[PDB]
Amino acid sequence: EVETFAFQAEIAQLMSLIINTFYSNKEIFLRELISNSSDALDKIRYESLTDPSKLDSGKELHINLIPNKQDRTLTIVDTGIGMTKADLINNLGTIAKSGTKAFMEALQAGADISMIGQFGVGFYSAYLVAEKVTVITKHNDDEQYAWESSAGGSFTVRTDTGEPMGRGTKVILHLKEDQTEYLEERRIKEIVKKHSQFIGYPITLFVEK
Ligand SMILES: CCCN(C)S(=O)(=O)c1cc(-c2n[nH]c(=O)n2-c2ccccc2F)c(O)cc1O
């Protein structure tokens, strides 16, 4: 069963700003999502130092980048801590409130959209390139869930029926028709090169056959 929720007013406002502002430096989305994946990997690695059984769901700690030209999707997979149902519906939105409000105030004061990460709301930059975002996630303490939004003020959460992922998060970006450059190997490599040194986990780019 699928449940539909409204985004918090400030998040809905930020999403409409990101979608409707003319902004050509769209490549920032990839650095933001990789940074988030790295933070989720730090979380599970840290927890595993006091409880090694936290890695029973998978010991490999990495990030995979999977472009798919046929489906027009860019998938970012990590084996981080994952997210609970409470994270998806409430708690991430609550933690984001101050940063979202502060980021929109900064933008009105002439700040650049590339500053989004400095406000802890980097995820929403995915809407610069994606018409729809699907997030499949699995936390040790909960079931596997699918979160999805095409913006427009709402998102859905459902228990995922698909392939079990063990632990971690898969972000599926359904790219806008004019944003297919982010499916090119050379383009992905170029973007990641301005970021991989700060990432303490292997980033593997899957080459299409
Ligand atoms: C509903 C959208 C969720 N995203 C796709 S996300 O927030 O960008 C994002 C989240 C995680 C994630 N898993 N576990 C966890 O704690 N995090 C996390 C990391 C950083 C900040 C807040 C967070 F919860 C991830 O592994 C990759 C992501 O792209």
Author numbering: 16 to 224
From the paper:
Here we report the investigation of the role of protein flexibility in the modulation of binding kinetics and equilibrium thermodynamics of drug binding to heat shock protein 90 (HSP90). It is a ubiquitous molecular chaperone intimately involved in a variety of pathways, including cell signaling, proliferation and survival, and protein folding.
For 7 of the 20 compounds, it was possible to obtain crystal structures of the complexes bound to N-HSP90 with loop-in and helical (8, 14, 16, 18, and 20) conformations of the α3-helix region (loop- and helix-binders, respectively). The main difference between the structures is the conformation of residues 104–111, which can adopt either helical or loop-in conformations. Steric clashes between the ligands and residues 105–107 would prohibit these complexes from existing in a loop-in conformation. In contrast, for the helix-binding compounds, there is a large favorable entropic contribution to binding, and most of them have a binding enthalpy penalty. This switch in thermodynamic profile is thus directly related to the conformation of the α-helix3 region with compensating differences in enthalpy and entropy of about 60 kJ mol−1 between loop-in and helix-binders. As previously mentioned, the N-HSP90 crystal structures show higher B-factors for residues 103–111 in the helical conformation, suggesting greater structural flexibility of this region compared to the loop-in conformation. In the helical structures, however, the Q23-N106 interaction is not possible due to the binding site rearrangement, and this may contribute to enhanced flexibility of the helical conformation of the α-helix3 region. on can vary significantly, indicating transition state destabilization playing a role in prolongation of residence time.
